[PDB]
Design a protein around this ligand. Structure first.
Ligand SMILES: NC(=O)c1ccc[n+]([C@@H]2O[C@H](COP(=O)([O-])OP(=O)(O)OC[C@H]3O[C@@H](n4cnc5c(N)ncnc54)[C@H](OP(=O)(O)O)[C@@H]3O)[C@@H](O)[C@H]2O)c1
Ligand SMILES: Nc1nc(N)c(NC(=O)Nc2ccc(C(=O)N[C@@H](CCC(=O)O)C(=O)O)cc2)c(=O)[nH]1
Ligand SMILES: Nc1nc(N)c(NC(=O)Nc2ccc(C(=O)N[C@@H](CCC(=O)O)C(=O)O)cc2)c(=O)[nH]1
Lengths: 297, 297
C-alpha cells in the first residue's frame, strides 16, 4: 500500500554540509586565512542541551569553521553570562554567537540575549532580527535555525504551499513563532494552535490542513488519524521520554504518532533524524552568510 | 429581537483621553513646560487620510500634546519624504512620528519607514519594535495602535480570548498583522485569512470562529450568515463607498454585513464609531509612553 515518503534529515544535512565545506575551503583561499567562527554557550548540564551543543560544534569543525566553546555553571550570574557574550562580540574571528536555550530559570533571558551584537545573532533571537521576517519585500539576512530547517524540509519535499491550509502547533521563539510567519509569506492560510488547545479543535484543524508543522514538545499530540490524506507533516518535537535502555535514560519522541501518520501523509519527517540535523545545518548556513557579510569590507 | 451589544468606540476613546489629559498636565508641571510632541506626516490629499490625520491632531491638541503637522504633496520624492522624517528624528521636542498610510505608489514604503528613529516609531512599524511584540514577559512600551484598540474593545466587552477560535481577515502591517500577533499572545487559536485563501474556506473558517476580526477593507466581505451564534465581531474595515449625501462624497463602510451579523453575534463594533476612535486614543497613549521614556534622560 502507498505510504508517506519519509524525508531523511540526516541526508539533507549531509548534502548541505558538503556544499558548505567546499565553500569554506574556497573562501579561505580567497580571503587569506579567514574562516567562519561559531561560538556556543551552554549553561548547566541538561543532557539534551549538551548533546545539541556537541553536535553543533562537531558539524562546525567538520565544515572548516572555528569553534569558541563556552561552558558556564547552572549558577551563572547575570553579569558573568553577559560579560561572556560581550567578550565574543569583540572577537573579530567569531561571526556567530549561540546561547543554548533553555537558560536557567533565575537568569533574565531577554536582558542577556539583548547583549548579543545583531550581526552575530545566529539564532535570530533579537527583536531587530526577528522583526524582519514579516517584510516580504525584503529577504532577511538571518532566519531562526529551526524555522529555517522546516522550510528547507518543505523545499526538499517540493509540496505546494500557496493557497494551502497550514497548521503550526506551538509558538516558540525559534520554532513555532517564526515558522508561522514564513509559511504565511508563501501565501499559506496559517492556523496556530497550542499543545493545551482543546483537543476537539486541534483535531478539526489538523483534519483540514494540507501541511502540519508540529513544534509543541508534546509526544503523541498529533494523532495519526487526524492527518489529512496526502498531507505533508513536519515533526519538530524533540521531547525526552524515559527509556532505561538508552545512554541518558531517555529517548527523543516527536509530537506526531508517526506509525499511523505515515499511512496517511504524502510526506513525513521522523524523530530523531528529521528536523534536528537540518536545524544544525541551518546554523552553519547562517554563520557562513554572516561570515561573508563581515568579510565584505 | 435579542441582539448583539454594539460596542461604543467613541466612549472608550473619550475615557482613555481624559486619563491621558490628566497625565500630560502633571508631567508639564513636573518637567517645567515640556510636553509630548506628535508629528503627523500626510502625503497628497486623500480625503480619508486628511480626516484621520485631522482627528489625530485634534485629539492630540485636546490632550495637551504639541503637534508637528507636516503636509507633503502627492508627487513628493523619496528623498524629500525621508528628509522630513530625518528632521523630525533630530527635533528634541518631537517624541513620535506617524507617516500616514497609504503613501503614494511611487514611494518605497519600507525604505521610507526605515528612516524613522526607533524610539519615535509611534505606529510600531519598525522591525526592532515589531520584534518585541511576542515578548510577553515584558510589557512593551510601544504597541501598534489599531491592534491595541481591538484588544481594548475585546477587554471592555469581557470577551474570553485564551483557547477561543479566532479568525483575522487580512495581514496588512497597520491592522491584520499585529492584531493576529496580539491575539496569538493570548493563546487563542488564530487563523489568518488573506487574498490567496479561497472564498469557500473563508466562509467555513468564519462559521467556526468565536471571535472575528476583519481588516481586509472590503465592504460586505463578512456575510452575517457566517457569524457563529454568540460570537464577538470586530470590524476594522474602513472603506470609502460613494454616497453624495455625505460631506466628502463617501460614507465609511465596514467589512461586516452588520445588520445581519447583529442578530447572531453577542458583541459587534459599528463602522464608523468603533475601532477608529480607539485607534487614535492608542496613538496618544504610545506617544505619552515615548515622552515619559525620553524625559527619564
Ligand atoms: N486607507 C485608510 O485610510 C485606512 C487606514 C487604516 C485602516 N484602514 C482599514 O483597515 C484595513 C487594514 O488594512 P491595511 O491598511 O493594514 O493594509 P491593506 O493592504 O489594506 O490590507 C488588506 C489586507 O486584507 C487582505 N484582503 C483584501 N481583500 C481580501 C479578500 N477579498 N479576501 C481575503 N483577504 C483580503 C489583503 O491580502 P493580501 O495580503 O493577500 O494582499 C491584505 O492582507 C483596510 O483594509 C481598511 O479598510 C484604512
Ligand atoms: N539558542 C538555541 N537554543 C536551542 N534550544 C535551539 N534548538 C536546538 O538546537 N535544537 C536541536 C534539536 C535537535 C538536534 C538534533 O540534531 N537531534 C538529533 C538526535 C539527537 C540525539 O542524538 O539525541 C536528531 O533529531 O536526529 C539539534 C538541535 C537552537 O537552535 N538555538
Ligand atoms: N501610519 C498610519 N497609517 C494609517 N492608515 C493608520 N490608520 C489610521 O489612522 N486609521 C484610522 C481609522 C479610523 C479613524 C477614525 O477615527 N474614524 C472615524 C470616522 C471619522 C470620519 O469619517 O468622520 C470612526 O471610525 O468612527 C482614525 C484613524 C495609522 O494608524 N497609522
Amino acid at each position: 500500500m502507498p505510504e508517506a515518503v519519509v524525508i531523511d534529515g540526516r541526508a539533507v544535512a549531509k548534502a548541505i554540509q558538503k556544499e558548505l565545506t567546499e565553500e569554506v575551503a574556497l573562501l579561505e583561499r580567497r580571503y587569506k586565512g579567514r574562516r567562519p567562527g561559531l561560538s556556543t554557550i551552554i549553561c548547566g548540564k541538561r543532557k539534551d542541551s549538551q548533546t545539541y551543543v556537541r553536535l553543533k560544534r562537531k558539524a562546525a569543525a567538520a565544515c572548516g569553521f572555528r569553534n569558541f566553546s563556552v561552558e558556564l555553571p547552572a549558577n551563572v550570574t547575570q553579569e558573568a553570562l553577559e560579560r561572556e557574550v560581550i567578550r565574543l562580540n569583540e572577537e573579530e574571528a567569531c561571526h556567530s554567537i549561540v546561547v543554548q536555550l533553555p537558560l536557567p530559570p533565575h537568569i533574565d533571558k531577554v536582558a542577556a540575549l539583548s547583549k548579543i551584537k545583531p550581526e552575530k545573532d545566529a539564532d535570530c533571537l533579537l527583536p531587530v532580527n526577528v522583526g524582519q521576517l514579516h517584510i516580504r519585500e525584503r529577504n532577511p539576512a538571518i532566519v531562526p535555525c529551526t524555522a529555517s530547517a522546516v522550510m528547507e524540509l518543505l523545499r526538499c519535499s517540493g509540496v505546494e504551499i500557496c493557497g494551502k491550509r497550514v497548521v503550526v502547533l506551538g509558538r516558540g521563539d525559534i520554532a513555532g513563532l517564526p515558522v508561522a510567519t514564513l509559511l504565511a509569506n508563501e501565501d499559506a492560510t496559517v492556523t496556530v494552535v497550542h499543545s493545551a488547545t482543546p483537543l476537539c479543535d486541534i483535531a478539526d484543524i489538523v483534519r483540514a490542513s494540507d501541511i502540519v508543522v508540529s513544534a509543541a514538545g508534546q509526544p503523541g499530540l498529533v494523532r495519526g488519524e487526524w492527518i489529512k490524506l496526502g498531507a505533508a507533516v513536519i515533526d519538530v518535537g524533540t521531547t525526552p521520554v524515559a527509556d532505561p535502555s538508552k545512554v541518558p535514560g531517555y529517548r527523543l519522541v516527536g509530537d506526531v504518532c508517526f506509525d499511523v501518520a505515515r499511512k496517511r501523509a504524502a510526506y513525513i519527517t521522523p524523530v530523531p533524524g528529521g528536523v534536528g540535523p537540518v536545524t544544525v545545518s541551518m546554523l552553519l548556513k547562517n554563520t557562513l552568510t554572516m561570515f561573508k557579510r563581515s568579510v565584505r569590507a
